[PDB]
Design a binder for these strands. Sequence first.
RNA 1: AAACUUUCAACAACGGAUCUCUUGGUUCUGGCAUCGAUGAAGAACGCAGCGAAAUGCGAUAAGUAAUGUGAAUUGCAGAAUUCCGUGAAUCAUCGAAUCUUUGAACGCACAUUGCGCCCGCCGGUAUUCCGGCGGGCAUGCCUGUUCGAGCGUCAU
RNA 2: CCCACCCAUACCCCGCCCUCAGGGUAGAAACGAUGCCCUGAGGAGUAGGCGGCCGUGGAGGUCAGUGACGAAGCCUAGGGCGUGAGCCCGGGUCGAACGGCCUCUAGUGCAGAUCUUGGUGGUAGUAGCAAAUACUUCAAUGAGAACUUGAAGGACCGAAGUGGGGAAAGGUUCCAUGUGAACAGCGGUUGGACAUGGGUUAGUCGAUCCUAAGCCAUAGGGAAGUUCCGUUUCAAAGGGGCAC
RNA 3: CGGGACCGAGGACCGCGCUCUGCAAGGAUGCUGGCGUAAUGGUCACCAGCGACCCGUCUUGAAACACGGACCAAGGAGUCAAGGUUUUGCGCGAGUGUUUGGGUGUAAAACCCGCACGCGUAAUGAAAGUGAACGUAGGUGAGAGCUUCGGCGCAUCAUCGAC
RNA 4: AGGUUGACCUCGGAUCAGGUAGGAGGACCCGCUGAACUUAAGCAUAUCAAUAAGCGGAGGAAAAGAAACCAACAGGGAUUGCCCUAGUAACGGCGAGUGAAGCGGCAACAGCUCAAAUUUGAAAGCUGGCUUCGGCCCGCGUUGUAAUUUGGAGAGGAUGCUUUGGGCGAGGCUCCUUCUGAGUUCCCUGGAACGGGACGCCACAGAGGGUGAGAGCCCCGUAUAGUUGGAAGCCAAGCCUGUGUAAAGCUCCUUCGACGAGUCGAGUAGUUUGGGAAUGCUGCUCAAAAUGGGAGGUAAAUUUCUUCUAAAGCUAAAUACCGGCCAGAGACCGAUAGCGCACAAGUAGAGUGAUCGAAAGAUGAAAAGCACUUUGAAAAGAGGGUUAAAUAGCACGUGAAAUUGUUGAAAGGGAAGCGCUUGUGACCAGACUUGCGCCCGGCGGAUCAUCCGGUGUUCUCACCGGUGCACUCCGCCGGGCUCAGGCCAG
Lengths: 203, 133, 260
Amino acid sequence: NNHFRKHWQRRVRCHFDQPGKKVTRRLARRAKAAALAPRPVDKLRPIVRCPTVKYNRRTRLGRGFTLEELKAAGIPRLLAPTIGIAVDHRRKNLSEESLAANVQRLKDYKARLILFPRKSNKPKKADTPKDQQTAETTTSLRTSFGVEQPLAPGFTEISKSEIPAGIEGGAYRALRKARSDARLVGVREKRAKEKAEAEANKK
Amino acid sequence: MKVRPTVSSSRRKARKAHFSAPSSVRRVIMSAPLSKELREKYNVRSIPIRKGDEVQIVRGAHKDKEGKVTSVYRLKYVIHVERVTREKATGQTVPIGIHPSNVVITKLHLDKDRENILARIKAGREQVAKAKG
Amino acid sequence: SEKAGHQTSAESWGTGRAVARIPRVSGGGTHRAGQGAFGNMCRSGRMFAPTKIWRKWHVKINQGQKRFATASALAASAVAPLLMARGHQVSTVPEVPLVVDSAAVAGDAVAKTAAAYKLLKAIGAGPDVEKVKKSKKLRAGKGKMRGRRHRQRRGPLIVYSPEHDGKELVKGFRNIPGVETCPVDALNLLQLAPGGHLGRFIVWTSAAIKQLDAVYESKKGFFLPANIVSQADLSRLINSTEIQSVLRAPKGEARTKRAC
RNA sequence: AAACUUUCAACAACGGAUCUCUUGGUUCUGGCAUCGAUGAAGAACGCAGCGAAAUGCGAUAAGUAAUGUGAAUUGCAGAAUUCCGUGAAUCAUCGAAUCUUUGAACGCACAUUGCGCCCGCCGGUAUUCCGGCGGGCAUGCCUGUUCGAGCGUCAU
RNA sequence: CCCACCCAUACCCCGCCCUCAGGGUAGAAACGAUGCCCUGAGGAGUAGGCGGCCGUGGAGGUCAGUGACGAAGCCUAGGGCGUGAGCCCGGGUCGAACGGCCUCUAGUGCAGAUCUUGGUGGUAGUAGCAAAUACUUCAAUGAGAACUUGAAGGACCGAAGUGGGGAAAGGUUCCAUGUGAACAGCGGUUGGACAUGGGUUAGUCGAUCCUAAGCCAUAGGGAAGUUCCGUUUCAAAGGGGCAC
RNA sequence: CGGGACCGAGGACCGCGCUCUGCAAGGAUGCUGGCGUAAUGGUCACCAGCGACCCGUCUUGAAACACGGACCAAGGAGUCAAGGUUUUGCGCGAGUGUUUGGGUGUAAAACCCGCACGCGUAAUGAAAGUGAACGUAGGUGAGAGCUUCGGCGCAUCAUCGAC
RNA sequence: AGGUUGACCUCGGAUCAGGUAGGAGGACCCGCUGAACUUAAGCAUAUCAAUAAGCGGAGGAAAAGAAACCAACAGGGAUUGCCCUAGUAACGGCGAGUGAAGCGGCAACAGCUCAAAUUUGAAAGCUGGCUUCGGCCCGCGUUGUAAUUUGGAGAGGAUGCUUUGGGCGAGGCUCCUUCUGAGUUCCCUGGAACGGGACGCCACAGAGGGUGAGAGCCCCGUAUAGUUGGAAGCCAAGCCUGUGUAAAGCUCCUUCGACGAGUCGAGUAGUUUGGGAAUGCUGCUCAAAAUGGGAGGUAAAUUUCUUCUAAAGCUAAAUACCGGCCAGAGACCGAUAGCGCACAAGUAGAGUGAUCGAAAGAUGAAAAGCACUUUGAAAAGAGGGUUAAAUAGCACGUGAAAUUGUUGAAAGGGAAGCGCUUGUGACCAGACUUGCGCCCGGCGGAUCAUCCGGUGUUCUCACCGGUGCACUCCGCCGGGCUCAGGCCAG
């Protein structure tokens, strides 16, 4: 299995510039941090659950918070990207757990947020006062607001008295019954119409 | 060891720059040390050499000879000193090439540009010594 | 260059009676016309198997093996016979491994090269420094014209703690030839075993000596290895009573008499 | 015996190997975004006291202005530099200029230094003739101005 | 049929080399133990397989390495070591760098390929240097004259010329003065050679103008397009006069 | 009992012995002469006796034929990458792999970091799917090593069973 | 006057006023067009390859890009790129072969603008011209220029709170500029120290180069903080003032809620893809709809469900880079190498032309490149200088081999060359020269044995300081003796 039957030597890519590109990326990150100081270098990201059954056991960072999440957290959608909150309008909240977790995340960020006034001589009501403007700050929201518990806890201790009785008939038999019912859902409903029609005809 | 990224330790580039330097760079390259009493007088170690200076040769076969700098021939990096010459076959007198790093300047041809040069070198040396002190 | 030896128009003159069937440069009016081309045996031709940039230049080494080798070189640097076997002048060194108090190096104590050199002379690395100083020689070969003009021996390596000793001692020790400096948390095997030969002379600071155990405890996935031999003294093992009390009688001597 | 041929050695030839060198290649890495009708890239022809080329330049022609440096250039000739200076230099920088005939190449042509047209200025006795100088005259398309054409639609 | 004698790398005895096999060698006075000691057997080799060593360019370490009181290279009827590839020294020459050891690395080892480039032999002072009838005398110049010049003679082209002029092509070869080498398949004082200068004057001679065979713009139509057709077209494609 | 040739390996003692003050018994010593240098030895040139086809290359079984080679100097031809497979060394080991990336740096080096991921840890079936202990993880015969001398029996092989 | 006088529409002219396009470059980028050699035994499917050549068009990047997406999960959420998915799903004569995508980790992150609405109580919009810089005109435009809305919504209501404009600006950063440490100390070799020895010094500088041979301190530079002078930008802690005519945000809602057509889609043909049942593009024919439409990788009907919202448009970054410009490097090459080119090299030269295309580096530290004499017509030769060296003479560092000349030695009756072994001649390397041990005699000295103290060690061995008083130790010179010594031999 050697795919060398084309003119492969004309598009061979080497990577001698790997440390130089790392140096260039680090210089760009330092310049971005110096330009964005005292704001963090990145935006706040929500916690979302990965698709498919292979990866639905793990959570990660998403693109941006939903409009419903921002509305529940009390942050207007025009203010949100101006104070370092990423906003996604395509994502929806199909369940209450992820919505509540992201609302709590937004509330923690808003509680830890320091908002400087646009004009220093005229502070506003929603603006952080100068005597609380000084504190120890963070510049990495991916570090200070990462995914703390990506997977579920793999070990838990319970007392011997509260051991559940489990599914009657066994877990293996329950799985087999579920598969059999899923395969036979249509035929049983068809013979249900057939029995109903026979009863209506010969009532 | 050099640290700056604009500095090259390439021998090829160094030799190309040295042997293809223009006249204003060759003037800086063709520098000579001052004498001792000139060094305590002006607080200057080295100056670019020029016509009319008085030098003492301290290296080569014409060591301890003194004379006036009659020519500064920058095209082969040579100064022509008075009476430090030789004869041809015919007996005619031709000057002998001396590199400026093999002489020491004992008397300066002083004009106001040279005074400004000496004054600013002395001021720079003093302010560096004061800053590092 | 990938086009070297191929920027010509040349064709062979065919099978005949006079010349060989190498491709010959067409045209006329110049010395190049009729001359051979495209062959590795030809003048002004392409070589056999031209060198490519996608040769494997870098070698991937297991981090466990790197840490093993670094620990082995560190252990070899505490053995004074290996220090002499690697060519170091350590006869006046008071103790191996050499530990100097951090008060002599911390801050700007040895930020000056004269102060650093005086400290080396006081602690006894002076003969090694002088050996490196007078070992300077001009290189034999093309490295002189390719930027490697001189060769000299390796002197002491000073291992320090950047948190407690600072980093101005690096500037102090920089200009002394052969003297190298290293933080305790970034130890380099290329410095600990120069040329693959064990027993580098190391000047330690007290802070680095203290921090070495934390450094080797902070290496994740690596423990200090277990040796396959517990007692390295083969003479004691062989001539111990436990082995010698169960041996047979010797069946001969070192020299055997000729029978016939 | 010599000559001749061959062998060995020393010196001298022929030739340019070897060794050492290297203002050059080759490969990698880092940085930057900037040609042209306000006439590019390229081509031709010229320019130095004494040059054919390379280099630089354009009839302001190995160059001008400006800024800086501060005493050269050099093969010869000849001049310097009030050296206590509006200043040497085949010097550096470079923001002001000059920039021949061409070339996308633009009046029509060009295998011709060919032939025109429009408008000014100057000179020769010159309202008419002759000569010189200066500024213009390509195509496609856009916006606008102005002059128009057509029972194409109307009003009157 | 008999006796004696000759000699193969065969057989016997001895020495030495290598390989293989079998033993010994630590309460170490003990060893490049990867060593040493003892004993025995064996020895050809293509394709092919394997091991060890020698050499070259470069890199890390090391030898407190060699060197202008002479590095590298080169020459040597001069020596030493190795079975060998090779290593080392002496002598001469020469002028600026180079080597030993352990690892690392490769564009790493030549008698061939009608190779590749460059250089040089025998042939060999050889084949030739014989078409176009042909040269000779005196003087001058000069170092030198068959092939320079002047004169004196003899000849040839024979007007479809070995003459006097042009078109194409060339580009200074034209003229004067001077000239070492090179070239003129000899010779050269001569030269279309070399060096420095000079020389081409138009209203009337040609070009320039006209159109021929033909070629190229424009309108317009094709073509992804570089561009193709089109040259009078399915174009609003312009001249003159008069005016109270 | 004579006559002659070639050879002298080893390097304190040990042993087998005998003809036993010692010896011919597990390998040469003793005495004497000339010379002490080109005398021995070595290198080069040449003569002499004997010996001795010109090298590759190709062909088949082999020669012959054929093809290349006037001479000399310098180049001049199984390399590099990717992916397998077996063996050697090394680290870790039911795990292993830092180097896509991040941190850091005396800055293309070195040092440090971890999520995912690759391979392995389970197979079989076209698929739906299902999924590896009756037993000190079995019986019998071998089997190194150990043993309290009764046996216990590694690796591995044959064979009958179990999942 | 109406047979006139005009308003429009369309189409023209002008060296009209003002503008723009072309060509170059093209390594990387966006498209079009498009092979064959090769690999399949050969060979029309295929492979090479959706590649080379050809054509059009940009920029510092381009392109793509804010879902008519992926999915089927507890759902992710614009684009790009790296790792992985994965040599996997899948396609494939007679098989050679080909070959993605979702998820996941990371680099980088950024979002928006129109058409479809009546401003209708006032085209509120804009090009150009003239300006006294206040404006005023000629026009464009109602077959629609501003404000408002873009699906995430929005419009209309209700409702009560919040939001905003200017001007300085300390200070900081970027780019050129002045300036920076220490021996030419003594001796030797040498033509020349930059070599060797001695004594110093500097080092946030012992990188590199030059200087008559290997220079940290002779010179340029090199390291580090700064320090002079100048311009243009950007960031920025703070501080002065206007305040609500206007716009803007948040919460809730009866109602309304326009959303891109020869397009989507279908058939067919060509081409392409892993999508030769599930791909994309183009041509021809047909040709839509309003909870409609697209997709949901096996054809169809029916009933559901999930996801977005096409046929209009913009947008940095992470990514590419054999072209250009500036720079730094290398276990690369060292003049037949390395680019064809280290040199007046894309030059000389060849070809009608398209094109083809070399050879060629090194005197010496410094020309000091040979005065003068003499012989030659001259080139040159010989003396004689110059140099450290001419055994460096502009044929020039070193100067191999083939091949040649001279000198010296030798062999040769139709080949030489080679092996074994003598011999002759020529020329050489070794070895040897005496060592060691005793016995006398003569000198010069007491680091002889024992004891004491100190010190170190291997803890019983040593060294050091006092003690020897010469029958004891150590050197030197004369004699004698033994042993061992080189080559060839009996």
